[model samples]
Target: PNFSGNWKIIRSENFEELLKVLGVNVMLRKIAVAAASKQAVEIKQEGDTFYIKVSTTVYTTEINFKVGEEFEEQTVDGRPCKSLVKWESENKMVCEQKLLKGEGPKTSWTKELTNDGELILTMTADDVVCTQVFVRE
Candidate 1:
């Protein structure tokens, strides 16, 4: 448990760059930036289980799963998609999502303690990877 808590997604790493890699249209990227700026993320963990909630001005998405447990999750943010997540490395999580309904993308989220003791969340999706750095308040 030290990973269990309510933290914020204060900053993004390669967000725009990743979006472009995801095949997001230029026009949509502009709109997405505005939407993403107003978005906040929270992840709650119970043992090896997790509940992740993403909130934005226009939409909100939530996911609940346990490490090593396979479940079908719908991708409600952009397209109607399904995916499976599994625990890979010690603190690394892997997600195989059927984006747009087919073999869409394979993403991975990994959490680790930095040298400064901060928690870093990294996501790699469709060759678009970003990181969210967080600190406990």
Candidate 2:
């Protein structure tokens, strides 16, 4: 159930729509669209803390958080939020994100590792859903 490894995005569904619903501007959306296919994520776990690093063709972002503890986070597109991450099971983790400013539905995402060692991320906000699949690198 350990999720400490590098993952490369293989495919994504509804990602642009999800970003639009989250209020991302057109310019950034275009960049994101082009970069999505080239995304890579690195996950590291130390004790109860988890470090997640996301790399895209346009930018790189890093997040550090402990399960059950609230922390400040900023989305890749620059929206600020309060976030809390929790474990759903040994191979699944869920994160809740509340925007600190602007009007939008709160978002949550689940990251799970499949039995075949693939990573699946499902993100939801209001009625929008985005799913991204990654392969171990």
Candidate 3:
């Protein structure tokens, strides 16, 4: 439950499909796929507040929010969204994202640390689900 560390992406499944579902174009999807392995995430939690940073070759995004509080966020792809973070369980945290412009389905993701100390993020947008696994660095 201690998600306060640096993590590097080790593998990802169905990421391309998820991107497509989110309205990403072919060229951007290819770029995203090519840079997948270079992704890194850092998470820091203090009481009810959480800070999350995601870095990729194309962009770096940082977000700060408190549990159960909704805040405005700009997606990595530059879309505006409303986001809320909440605990799904003792070891799991879920982030809900609602796009504020254009046409797209709402999205959510759950993050949990495995017994092996690897971070697993399961992102969902309607029927598309992407699972990304990360190892502590």
Give Cα-based local distance difference scores for all models.
0.64, 0.86, 0.85
What clash count goes with each model? 0, 0, 0
Best by TM-score: 3
How many clashing pairs in candidate 1?
A: 0
Off by over 4 Å in 1: 74-77, 80-82, 88-90, 113-117
Model 3, 21-135: lDDT tens per residue?
Answer: 8789999998788787798999998887888999888778888888899998865456888988889887788988888887676688789988889999998888988899999
lDDT measured at residue 58 in model 3 versus the true structure, 0 to 100: 78
- Pairwise TM-score winner, candidates 1 and 2: 2
Model 1 agreement with the true structure over 1-137: per-residue lDDT tens digits: 25655555556667666667667878887777676656565678877788877677878778888766665655423555555666665565666666555554565556664556466777676666777776654
Give the candidates in order of lDDT, highest first.
2, 3, 1
Off by over 4 Å in 3: none
Candidate 2: lDDT of 76? 38
